[PDB]
Coordinates of C-alpha atoms and ligand atoms in Angstrom, one line a residue:
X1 CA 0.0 0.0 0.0
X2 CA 2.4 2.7 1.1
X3 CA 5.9 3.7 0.0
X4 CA 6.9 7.2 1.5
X5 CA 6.8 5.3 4.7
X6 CA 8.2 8.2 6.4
X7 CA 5.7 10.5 6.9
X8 CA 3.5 7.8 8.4
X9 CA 3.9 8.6 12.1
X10 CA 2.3 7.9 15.8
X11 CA 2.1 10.0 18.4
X12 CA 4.0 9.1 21.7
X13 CA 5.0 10.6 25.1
X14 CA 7.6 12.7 24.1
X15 CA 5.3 14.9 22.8
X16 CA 2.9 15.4 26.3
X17 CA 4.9 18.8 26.9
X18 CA 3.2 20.3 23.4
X19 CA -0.1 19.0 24.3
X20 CA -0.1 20.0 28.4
X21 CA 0.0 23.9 26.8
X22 CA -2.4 23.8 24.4
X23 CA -4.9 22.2 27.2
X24 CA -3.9 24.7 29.9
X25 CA -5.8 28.1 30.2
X26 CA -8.2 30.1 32.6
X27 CA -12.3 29.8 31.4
X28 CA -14.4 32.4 32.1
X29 CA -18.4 32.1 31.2
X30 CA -21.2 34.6 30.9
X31 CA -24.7 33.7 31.1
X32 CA -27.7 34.8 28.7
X33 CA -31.3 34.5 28.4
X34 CA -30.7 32.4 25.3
X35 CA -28.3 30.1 27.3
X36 CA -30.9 29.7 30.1
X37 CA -34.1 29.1 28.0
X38 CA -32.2 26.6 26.1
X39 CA -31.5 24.8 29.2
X40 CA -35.1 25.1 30.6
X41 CA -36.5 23.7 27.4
X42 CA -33.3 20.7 27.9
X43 CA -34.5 19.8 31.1
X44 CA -38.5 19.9 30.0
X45 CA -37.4 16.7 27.3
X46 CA -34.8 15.6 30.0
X47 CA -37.2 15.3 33.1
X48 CA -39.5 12.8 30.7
X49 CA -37.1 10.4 30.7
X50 CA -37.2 7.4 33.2
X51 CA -33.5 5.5 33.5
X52 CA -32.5 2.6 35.0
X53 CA -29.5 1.1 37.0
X54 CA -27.3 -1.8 35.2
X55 CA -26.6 -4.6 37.3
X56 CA -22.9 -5.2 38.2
X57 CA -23.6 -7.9 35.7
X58 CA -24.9 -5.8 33.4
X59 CA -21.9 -3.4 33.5
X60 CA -19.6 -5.9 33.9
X61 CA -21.1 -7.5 30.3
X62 CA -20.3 -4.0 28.7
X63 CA -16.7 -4.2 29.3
X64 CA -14.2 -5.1 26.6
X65 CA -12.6 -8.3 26.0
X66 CA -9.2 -6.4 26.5
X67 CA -9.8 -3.4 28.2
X68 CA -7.8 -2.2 30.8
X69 CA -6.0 -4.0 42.5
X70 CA -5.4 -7.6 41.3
X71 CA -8.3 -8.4 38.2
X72 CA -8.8 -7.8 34.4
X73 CA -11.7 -7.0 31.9
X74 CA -11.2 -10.7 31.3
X75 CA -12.1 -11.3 35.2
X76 CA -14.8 -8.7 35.0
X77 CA -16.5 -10.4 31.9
X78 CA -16.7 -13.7 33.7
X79 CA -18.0 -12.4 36.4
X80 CA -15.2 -13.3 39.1
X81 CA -16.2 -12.3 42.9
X82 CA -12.7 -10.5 43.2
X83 CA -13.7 -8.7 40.6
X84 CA -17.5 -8.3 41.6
X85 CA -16.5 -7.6 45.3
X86 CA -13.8 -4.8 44.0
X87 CA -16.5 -3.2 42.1
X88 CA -19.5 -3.2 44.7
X89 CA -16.4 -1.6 47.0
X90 CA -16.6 1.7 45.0
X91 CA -20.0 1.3 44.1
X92 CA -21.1 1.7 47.9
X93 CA -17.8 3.8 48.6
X94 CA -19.9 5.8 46.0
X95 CA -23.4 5.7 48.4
X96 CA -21.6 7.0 51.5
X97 CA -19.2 9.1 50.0
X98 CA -12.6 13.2 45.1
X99 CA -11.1 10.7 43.0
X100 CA -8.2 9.5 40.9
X101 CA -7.5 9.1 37.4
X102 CA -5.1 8.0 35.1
X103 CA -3.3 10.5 32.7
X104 CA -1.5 8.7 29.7
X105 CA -0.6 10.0 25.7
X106 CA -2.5 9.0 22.8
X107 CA -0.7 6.9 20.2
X108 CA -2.1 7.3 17.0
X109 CA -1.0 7.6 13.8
X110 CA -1.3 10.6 10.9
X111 CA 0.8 11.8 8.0
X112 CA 3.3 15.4 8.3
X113 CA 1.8 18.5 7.9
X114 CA 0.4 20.3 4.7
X115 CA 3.0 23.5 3.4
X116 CA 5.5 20.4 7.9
X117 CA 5.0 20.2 11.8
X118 CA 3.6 16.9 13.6
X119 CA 0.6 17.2 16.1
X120 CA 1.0 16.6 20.0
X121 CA -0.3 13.4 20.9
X122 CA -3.5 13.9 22.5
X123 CA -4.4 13.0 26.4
X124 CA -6.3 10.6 27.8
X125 CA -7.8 10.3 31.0
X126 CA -9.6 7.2 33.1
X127 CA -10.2 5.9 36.6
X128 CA -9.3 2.2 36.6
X129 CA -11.5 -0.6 35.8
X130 CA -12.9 -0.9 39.3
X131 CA -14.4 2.7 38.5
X132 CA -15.3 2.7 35.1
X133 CA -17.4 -0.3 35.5
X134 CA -19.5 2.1 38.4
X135 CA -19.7 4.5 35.6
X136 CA -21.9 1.9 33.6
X137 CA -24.0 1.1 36.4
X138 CA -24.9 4.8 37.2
X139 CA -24.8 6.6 34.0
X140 CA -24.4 3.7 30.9
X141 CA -28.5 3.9 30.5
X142 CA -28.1 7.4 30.8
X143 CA -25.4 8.6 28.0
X144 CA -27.3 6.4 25.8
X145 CA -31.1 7.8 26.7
X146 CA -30.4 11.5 27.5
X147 CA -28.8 13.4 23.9
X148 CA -31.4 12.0 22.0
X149 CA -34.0 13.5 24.1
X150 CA -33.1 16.6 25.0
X151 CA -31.1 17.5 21.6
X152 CA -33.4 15.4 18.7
X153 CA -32.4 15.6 15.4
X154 CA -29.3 17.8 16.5
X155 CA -27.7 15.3 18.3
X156 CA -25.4 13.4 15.7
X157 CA -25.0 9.9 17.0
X158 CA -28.0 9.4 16.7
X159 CA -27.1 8.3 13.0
X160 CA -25.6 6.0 10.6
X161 CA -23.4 8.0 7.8
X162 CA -26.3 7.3 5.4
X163 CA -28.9 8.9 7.9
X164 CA -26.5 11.3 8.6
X165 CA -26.3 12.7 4.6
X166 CA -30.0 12.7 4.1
X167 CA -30.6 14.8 7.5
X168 CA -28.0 17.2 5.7
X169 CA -28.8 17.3 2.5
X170 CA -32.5 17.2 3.5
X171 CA -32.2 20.5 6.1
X172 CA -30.2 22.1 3.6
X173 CA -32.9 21.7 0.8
X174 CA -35.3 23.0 3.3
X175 CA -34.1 26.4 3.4
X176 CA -35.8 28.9 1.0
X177 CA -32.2 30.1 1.1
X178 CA -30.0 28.5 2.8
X179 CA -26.5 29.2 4.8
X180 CA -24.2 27.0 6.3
X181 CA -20.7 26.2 8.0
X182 CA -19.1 24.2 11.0
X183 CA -17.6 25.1 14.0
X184 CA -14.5 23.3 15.7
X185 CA -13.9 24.8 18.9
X186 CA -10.5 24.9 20.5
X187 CA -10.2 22.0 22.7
X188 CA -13.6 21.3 23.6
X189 CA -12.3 19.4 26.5
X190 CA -10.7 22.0 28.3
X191 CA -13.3 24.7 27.9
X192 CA -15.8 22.3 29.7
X193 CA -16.1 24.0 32.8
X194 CA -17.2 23.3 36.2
X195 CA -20.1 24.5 36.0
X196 CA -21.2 22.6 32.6
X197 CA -20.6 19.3 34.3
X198 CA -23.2 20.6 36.7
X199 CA -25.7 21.8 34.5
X200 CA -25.1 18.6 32.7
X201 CA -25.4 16.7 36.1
X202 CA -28.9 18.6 36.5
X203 CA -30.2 17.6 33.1
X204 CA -29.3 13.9 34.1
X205 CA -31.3 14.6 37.4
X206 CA -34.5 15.6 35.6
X207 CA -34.7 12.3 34.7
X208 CA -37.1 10.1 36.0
X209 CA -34.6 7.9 38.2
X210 CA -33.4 5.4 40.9
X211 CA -33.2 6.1 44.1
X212 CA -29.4 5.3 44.3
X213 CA -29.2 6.1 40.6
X214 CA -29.1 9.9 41.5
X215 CA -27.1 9.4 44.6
X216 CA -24.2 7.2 42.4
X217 CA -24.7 10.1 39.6
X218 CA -24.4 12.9 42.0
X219 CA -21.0 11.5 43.6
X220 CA -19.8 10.5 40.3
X221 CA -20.6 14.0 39.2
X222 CA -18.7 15.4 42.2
X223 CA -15.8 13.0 42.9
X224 CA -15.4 12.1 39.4
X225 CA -16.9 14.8 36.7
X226 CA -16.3 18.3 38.0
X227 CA -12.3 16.8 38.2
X228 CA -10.0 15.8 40.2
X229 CA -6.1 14.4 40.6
X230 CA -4.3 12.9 37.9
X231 CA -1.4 10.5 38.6
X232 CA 0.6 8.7 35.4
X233 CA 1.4 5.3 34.8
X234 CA 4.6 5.1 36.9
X235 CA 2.7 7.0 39.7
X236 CA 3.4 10.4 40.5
X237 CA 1.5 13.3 40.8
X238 CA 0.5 15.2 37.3
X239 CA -1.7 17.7 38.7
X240 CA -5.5 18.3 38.9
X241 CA -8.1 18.5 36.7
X242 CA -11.1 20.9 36.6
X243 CA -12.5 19.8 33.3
X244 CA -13.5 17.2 30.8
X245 CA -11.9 14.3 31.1
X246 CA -11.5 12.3 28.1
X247 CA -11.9 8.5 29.1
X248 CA -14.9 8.6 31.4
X249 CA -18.3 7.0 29.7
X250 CA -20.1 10.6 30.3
X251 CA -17.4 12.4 28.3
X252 CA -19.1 11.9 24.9
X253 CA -22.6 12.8 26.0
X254 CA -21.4 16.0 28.6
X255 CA -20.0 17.2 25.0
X256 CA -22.3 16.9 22.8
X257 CA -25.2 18.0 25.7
X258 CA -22.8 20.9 25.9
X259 CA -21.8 22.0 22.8
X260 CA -25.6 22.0 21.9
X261 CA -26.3 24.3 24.9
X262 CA -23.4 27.0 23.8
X263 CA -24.0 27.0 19.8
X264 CA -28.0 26.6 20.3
X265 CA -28.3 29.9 22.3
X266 CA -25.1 31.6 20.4
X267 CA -27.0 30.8 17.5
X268 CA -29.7 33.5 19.6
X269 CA -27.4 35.7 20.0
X270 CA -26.0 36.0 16.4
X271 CA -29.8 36.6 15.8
X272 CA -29.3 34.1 12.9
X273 CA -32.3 33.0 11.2
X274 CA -34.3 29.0 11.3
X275 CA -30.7 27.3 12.9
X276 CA -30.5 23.7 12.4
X277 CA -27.6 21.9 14.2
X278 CA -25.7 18.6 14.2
X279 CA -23.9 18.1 17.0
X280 CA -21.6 15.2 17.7
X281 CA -19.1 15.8 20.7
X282 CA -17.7 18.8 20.3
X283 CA -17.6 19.5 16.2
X284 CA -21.1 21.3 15.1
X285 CA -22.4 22.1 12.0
X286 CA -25.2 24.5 11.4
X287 CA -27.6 24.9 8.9
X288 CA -29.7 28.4 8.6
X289 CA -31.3 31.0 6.9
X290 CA -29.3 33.2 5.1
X291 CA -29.9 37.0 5.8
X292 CA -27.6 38.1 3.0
X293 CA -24.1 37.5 2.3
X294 CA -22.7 40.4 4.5
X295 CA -25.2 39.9 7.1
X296 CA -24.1 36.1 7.3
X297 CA -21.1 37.1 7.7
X298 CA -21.3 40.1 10.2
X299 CA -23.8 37.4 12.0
X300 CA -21.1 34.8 11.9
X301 CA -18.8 37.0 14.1
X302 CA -21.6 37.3 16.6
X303 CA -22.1 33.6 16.7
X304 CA -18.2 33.5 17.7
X305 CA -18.4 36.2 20.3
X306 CA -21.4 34.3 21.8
X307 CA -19.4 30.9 21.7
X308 CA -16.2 32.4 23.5
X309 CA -18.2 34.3 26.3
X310 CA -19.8 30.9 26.8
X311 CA -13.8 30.1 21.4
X312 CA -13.0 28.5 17.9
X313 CA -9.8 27.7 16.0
X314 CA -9.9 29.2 12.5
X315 CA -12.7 31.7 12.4
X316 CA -15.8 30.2 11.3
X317 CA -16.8 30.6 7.2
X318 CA -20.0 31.7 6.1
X319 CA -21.2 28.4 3.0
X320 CA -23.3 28.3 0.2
X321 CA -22.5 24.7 -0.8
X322 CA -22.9 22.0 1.3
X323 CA -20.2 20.3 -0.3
X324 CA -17.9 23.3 0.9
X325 CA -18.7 22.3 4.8
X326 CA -16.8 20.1 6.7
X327 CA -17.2 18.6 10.2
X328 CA -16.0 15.6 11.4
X329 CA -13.2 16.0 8.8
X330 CA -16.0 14.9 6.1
X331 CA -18.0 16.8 3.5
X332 CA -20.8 15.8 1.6
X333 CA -20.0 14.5 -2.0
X334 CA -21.8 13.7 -4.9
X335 CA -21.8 10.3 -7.2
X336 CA -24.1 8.7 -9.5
X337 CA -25.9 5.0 -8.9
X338 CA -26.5 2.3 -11.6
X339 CA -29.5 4.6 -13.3
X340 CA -27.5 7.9 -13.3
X341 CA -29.8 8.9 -10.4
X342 CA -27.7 11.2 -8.2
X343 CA -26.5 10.2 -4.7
X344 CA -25.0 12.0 -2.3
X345 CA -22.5 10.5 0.3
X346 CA -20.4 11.5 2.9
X347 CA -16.2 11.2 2.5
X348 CA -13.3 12.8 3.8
X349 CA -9.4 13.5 2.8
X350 CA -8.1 9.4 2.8
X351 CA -4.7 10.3 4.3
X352 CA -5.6 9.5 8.0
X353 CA -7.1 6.0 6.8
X354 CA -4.8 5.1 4.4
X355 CA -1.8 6.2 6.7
X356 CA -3.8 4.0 9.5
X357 CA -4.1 0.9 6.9
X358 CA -0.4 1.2 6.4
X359 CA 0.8 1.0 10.0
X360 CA -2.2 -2.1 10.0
X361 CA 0.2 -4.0 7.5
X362 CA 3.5 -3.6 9.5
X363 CA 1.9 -3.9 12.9
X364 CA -1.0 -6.0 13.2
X365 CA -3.6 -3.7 16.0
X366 CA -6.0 -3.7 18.9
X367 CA -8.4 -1.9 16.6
X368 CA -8.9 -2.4 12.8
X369 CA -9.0 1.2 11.4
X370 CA -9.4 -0.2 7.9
X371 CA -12.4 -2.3 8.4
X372 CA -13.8 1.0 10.2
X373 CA -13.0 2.8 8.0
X374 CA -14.8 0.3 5.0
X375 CA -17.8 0.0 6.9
X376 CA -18.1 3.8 7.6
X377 CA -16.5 5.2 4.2
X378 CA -18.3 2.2 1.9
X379 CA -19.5 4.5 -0.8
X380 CA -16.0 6.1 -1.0
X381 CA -13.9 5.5 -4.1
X382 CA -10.7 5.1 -2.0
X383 CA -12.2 3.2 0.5
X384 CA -13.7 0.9 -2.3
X385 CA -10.7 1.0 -4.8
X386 CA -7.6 0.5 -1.8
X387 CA -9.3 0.0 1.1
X388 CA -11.8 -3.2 0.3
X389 CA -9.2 -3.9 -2.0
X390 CA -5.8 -4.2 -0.4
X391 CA -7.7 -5.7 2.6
X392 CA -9.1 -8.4 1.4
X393 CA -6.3 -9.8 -0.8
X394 CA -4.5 -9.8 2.7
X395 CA -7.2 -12.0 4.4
X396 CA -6.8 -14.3 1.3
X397 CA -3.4 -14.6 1.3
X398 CA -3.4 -15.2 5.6
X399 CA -6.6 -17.6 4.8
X400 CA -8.8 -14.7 7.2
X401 CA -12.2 -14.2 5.4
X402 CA -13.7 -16.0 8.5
X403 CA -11.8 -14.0 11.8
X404 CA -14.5 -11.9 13.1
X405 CA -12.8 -8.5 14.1
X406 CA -12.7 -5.9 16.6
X407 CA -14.6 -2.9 15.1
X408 CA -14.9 0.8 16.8
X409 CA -17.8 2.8 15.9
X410 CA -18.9 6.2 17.1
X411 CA -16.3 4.6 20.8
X412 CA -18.4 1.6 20.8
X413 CA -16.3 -1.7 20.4
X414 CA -17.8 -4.4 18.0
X415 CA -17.2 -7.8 16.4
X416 CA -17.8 -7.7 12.6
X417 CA -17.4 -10.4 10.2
X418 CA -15.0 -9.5 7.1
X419 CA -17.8 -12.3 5.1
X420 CA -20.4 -9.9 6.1
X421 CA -19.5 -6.7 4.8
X422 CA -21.9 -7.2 1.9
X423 CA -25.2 -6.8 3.8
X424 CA -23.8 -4.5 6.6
X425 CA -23.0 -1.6 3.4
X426 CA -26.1 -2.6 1.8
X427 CA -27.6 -1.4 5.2
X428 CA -25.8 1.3 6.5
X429 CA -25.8 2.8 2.7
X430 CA -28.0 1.2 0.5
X431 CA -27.6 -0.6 -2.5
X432 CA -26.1 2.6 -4.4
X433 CA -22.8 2.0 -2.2
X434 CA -22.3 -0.7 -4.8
X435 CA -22.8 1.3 -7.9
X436 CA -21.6 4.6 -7.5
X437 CA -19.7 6.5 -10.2
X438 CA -18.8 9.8 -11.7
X439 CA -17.3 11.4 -8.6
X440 CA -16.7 14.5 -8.4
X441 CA -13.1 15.8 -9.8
X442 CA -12.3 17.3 -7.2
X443 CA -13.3 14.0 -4.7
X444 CA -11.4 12.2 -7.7
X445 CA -8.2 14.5 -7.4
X446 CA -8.2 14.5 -3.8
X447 CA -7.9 11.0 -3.7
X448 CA -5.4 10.5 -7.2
X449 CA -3.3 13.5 -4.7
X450 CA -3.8 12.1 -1.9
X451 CA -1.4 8.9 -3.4
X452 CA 1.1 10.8 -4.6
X453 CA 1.9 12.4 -1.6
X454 CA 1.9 9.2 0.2
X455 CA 3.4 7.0 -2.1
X456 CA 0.7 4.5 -2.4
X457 CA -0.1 2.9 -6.0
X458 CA -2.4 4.8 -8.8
X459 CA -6.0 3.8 -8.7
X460 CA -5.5 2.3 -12.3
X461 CA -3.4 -0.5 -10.5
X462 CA -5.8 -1.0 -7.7
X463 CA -8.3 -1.9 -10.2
X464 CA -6.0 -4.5 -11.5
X465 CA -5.4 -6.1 -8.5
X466 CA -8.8 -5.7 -7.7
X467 CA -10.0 -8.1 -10.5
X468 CA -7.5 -10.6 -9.2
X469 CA -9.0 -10.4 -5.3
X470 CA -12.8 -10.4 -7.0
X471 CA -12.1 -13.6 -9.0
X472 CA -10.4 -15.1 -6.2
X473 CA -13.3 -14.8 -3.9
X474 CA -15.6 -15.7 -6.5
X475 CA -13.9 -19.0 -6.5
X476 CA -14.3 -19.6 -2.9
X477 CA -17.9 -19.6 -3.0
X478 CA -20.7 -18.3 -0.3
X479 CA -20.0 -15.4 1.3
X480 CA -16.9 -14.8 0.0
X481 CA -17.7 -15.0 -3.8
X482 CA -21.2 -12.5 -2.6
X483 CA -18.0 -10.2 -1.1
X484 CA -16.5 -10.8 -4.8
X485 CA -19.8 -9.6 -6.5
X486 CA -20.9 -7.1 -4.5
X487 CA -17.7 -5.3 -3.5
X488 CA -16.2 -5.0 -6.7
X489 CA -18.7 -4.5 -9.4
X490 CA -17.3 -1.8 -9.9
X491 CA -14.1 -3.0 -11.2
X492 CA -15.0 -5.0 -14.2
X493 CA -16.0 -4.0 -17.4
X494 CA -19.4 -5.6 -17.3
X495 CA -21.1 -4.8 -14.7
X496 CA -23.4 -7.2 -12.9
X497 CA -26.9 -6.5 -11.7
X498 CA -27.0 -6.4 -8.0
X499 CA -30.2 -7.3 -6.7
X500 CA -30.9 -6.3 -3.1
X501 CA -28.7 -9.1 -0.6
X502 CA -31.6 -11.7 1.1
X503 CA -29.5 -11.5 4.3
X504 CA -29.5 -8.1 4.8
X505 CA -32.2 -8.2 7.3
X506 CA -27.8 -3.3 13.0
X507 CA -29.6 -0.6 15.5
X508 CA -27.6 -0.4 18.6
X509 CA -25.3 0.6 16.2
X510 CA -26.2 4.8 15.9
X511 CA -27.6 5.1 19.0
X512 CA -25.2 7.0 21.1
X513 CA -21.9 8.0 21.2
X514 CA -19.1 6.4 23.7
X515 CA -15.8 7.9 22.7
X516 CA -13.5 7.4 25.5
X517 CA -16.1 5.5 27.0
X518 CA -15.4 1.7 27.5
X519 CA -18.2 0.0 25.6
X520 CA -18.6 -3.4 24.0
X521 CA -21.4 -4.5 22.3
Ligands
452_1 C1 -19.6 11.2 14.3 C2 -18.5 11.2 13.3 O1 -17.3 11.7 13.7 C3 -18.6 10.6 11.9 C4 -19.9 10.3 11.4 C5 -20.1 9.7 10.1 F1 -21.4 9.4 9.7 C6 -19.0 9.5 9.3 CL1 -19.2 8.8 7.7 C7 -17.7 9.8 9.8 C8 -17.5 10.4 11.1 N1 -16.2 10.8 11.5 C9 -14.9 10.6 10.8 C10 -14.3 9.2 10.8 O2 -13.3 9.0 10.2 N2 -15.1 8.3 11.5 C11 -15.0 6.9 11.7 C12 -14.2 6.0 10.8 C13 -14.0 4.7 11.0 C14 -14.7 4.0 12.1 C15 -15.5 4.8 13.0 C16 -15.6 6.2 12.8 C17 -16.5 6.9 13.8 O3 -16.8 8.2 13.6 O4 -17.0 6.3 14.8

């Protein structure tokens, strides 16, 4: 796959320093009338919601295979009264009574910088076992009940990448005239402030709960939320924290809850008209009436000011495309099915993946980027042309087609099938994720770029060697050759038809979103 196997790099520890003063700086909030209607309306959805306890059991069942006092995740899976006895020893610790957390570097891998300069690892932050399986118990039915209600369409978990075009491209052809752009603010994380994680604590307590439920919440929310220490793996003292942390379950929802809460009544302030958002952690995307071009943009600044006082990284761009937007480092694209009919799909610049698959060949991972990536990017041409095919020549020459993997989606850890890819795509996109063509030049360029740059074979060649893998799982039969037929149609010269798959007949799937969570499903 990749030759300039030198700008493929990982983050590692050396790099903590960079990343420690980028995450270190004073907040300072200001209320509104917007912020605080937003909030009353929050809590209106939130208090209809009734949530329930996990089990130990329950919790424990939720914790991964290999996830990180004396027991493991293997321990905790099984059941094991050390383990069960630890737990309920926090759980009630948690009942009658700040805590401590781990603070460790990131390790993943990207590509050097556009016109040079390599990105801090990021920092990660989570009790140990014994508390994160409490976290389950008390929150777990909670981070995956709450968003949904209180934020509705807005809240972008809620959505598979399919679902997630239409609601796009739908809102935006919705507007008489419509607006757009996306807004990354500056670590999220560290603008969290105290006083979010209470407001979110308070939206959790509208809920309809358990006794104990509110009091676990509550001391989770004070002993583990609002902050506390941080020690590192050998075991001194890094300091204190009085924000997000990143590897708690709540972490994705607190976000995402917050994020809404900030943008939704910015987007008051700005006085913008009919404001749609998608919110997903802390990247937003807004959809709106336009008020003019210099209005927009005047009302963009206003947005801004309104974030900050409740900041961004580049200043926020007024859009008149949807294709021109970008959040979640993907933009909406363009292709054509087998009848011309246009459909639109969602991509993104193929360096992260690619440079991800590379460092999958050399070093065989805890997590399988590239089958992600498939299953998320499926109507892609780069995830179709390199991706499906470079991986699945390797699981034929290893003899693999029948490993189930270990899959991450939106945090949540799965166990996918390589054999099954075919009705999962024809699901999560439709039977047009097999038939698409015609992308657009610059999607096209992008991606014929993006190779150079890295050094990996022209698409021309992929197709080769995809009519090699396609006949070779035709020749296997089942649900290999189906792979064959499905997956690569659109490599040979004459086409196929491809009826709709029988077994394609997948929902806890887009329901919520558990990054730095520890979820298994
Ligand atoms: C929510 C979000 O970030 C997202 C939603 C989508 F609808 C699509 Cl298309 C892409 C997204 N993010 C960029 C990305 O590269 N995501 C992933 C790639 C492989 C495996 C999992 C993810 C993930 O976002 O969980």
């Amino acid at each position: 796959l990749l030759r300039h196997h030198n700008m493929v790099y990982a983050t590692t520890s050396r790099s903590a320093g960079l990343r420690q003063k980028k995450v270190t700086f004073d907040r300072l909030q200001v209320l509104d009338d917007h912020y605080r209607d937003v909030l009353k309306e929050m809590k209106a959805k939130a208090s209809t919601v009734k949530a329930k306890l996990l089990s130990v059991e329950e919790a424990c069942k939720l914790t991964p295979p290999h996830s990180a006092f004396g027991y493991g995740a293997k321990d905790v899976r099984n059941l094991s009264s050390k383990a069960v006895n630890h737990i309920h020893s926090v759980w009630k610790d948690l009942l009658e009574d700040p805590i401590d957390t781990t603070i460790m570097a990131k390790n993943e891998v990207f590509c050097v910088q556009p016109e040079g300069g390599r990105k801090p690892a990021r920092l990660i932050v989570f009790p140990d076992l014994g508390v994160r399986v409490c976290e389950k118990m008390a929150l777990y039915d909670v981070v995956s009940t709450l968003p949904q209600v209180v934020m509705g369409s807005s809240y972008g978990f809620q959505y598979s990448p399919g679902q997630r075009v239409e609601f796009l491209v739908n809102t935006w052809k919705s507007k008489k005239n419509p607006m757009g752009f996306s807004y990354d603010t500056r670590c999220f994380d560290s603008t969290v402030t105290e006083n979010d994680i209470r407001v979110e604590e308070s939206i959790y307590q509208c809920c309809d709960l358990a006794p104990e439920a509110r009091q676990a919440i509550k001391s989770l929310t004070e002993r583990l939320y609002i902050g506390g220490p941080l020690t590192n793996s050998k075991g001194q003292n890094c300091g204190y924290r009085r924000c997000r942390a990143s590897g708690v379950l709540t972490t994705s929802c607190g976000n995402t809850l917050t994020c809404y809460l900030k943008a939704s009544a910015a987007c008051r302030a700005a006085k913008l008209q009919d404001c749609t958002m998608l919110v997903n952690g802390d990247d937003l995307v807004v959809i709106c009436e336009s008020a003019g071009t210099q209005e927009d943009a005047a009302s963009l600044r206003v947005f801004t000011e309104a974030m900050t006082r409740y900041p961004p990284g580049d200043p926020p761009q007024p859009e008149y495309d949807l294709e021109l937007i970008t959040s979640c480092s993907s933009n909406v694209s363009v292709a054509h099915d087998a009848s011309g009919k246009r459909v639109y799909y969602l991509t993104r610049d193929p360096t992260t993946p690619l440079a991800r698959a590379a460092w999958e060949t050399a070093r065989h991972t805890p997590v399988n980027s590239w089958l992600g990536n498939i299953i998320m990017y499926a109507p892609t041409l780069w995830a179709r042309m390199i991706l499906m095919t470079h991986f699945f020549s390797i699981l034929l020459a290893q003899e693999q087609l029948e490993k189930a993997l270990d899959c991450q989606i939106y945090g949540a850890c799965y166990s996918i099938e390589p054999l099954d890819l075919p009705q999962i795509i024809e699901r999560l996109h439709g039977l047009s994720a097999f038939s698409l063509h015609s992308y657009s030049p610059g999607e096209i360029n992008r991606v014929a770029s993006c190779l150079r740059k890295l050094g990996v074979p022209p698409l021309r060649v992929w197709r080769h060697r995809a009519r090699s893998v396609r006949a070779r799982l035709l020749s296997q039969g089942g649900r290999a050759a189906t792979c064959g037929k499905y997956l690569f149609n659109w490599a040979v010269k004459t086409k196929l038809k491809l009826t709709p798959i029988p077994a394609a007949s997948l929902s806890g799937w887009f329901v919520a979103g558990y990054s730095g969570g520890d979820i298994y499903h």
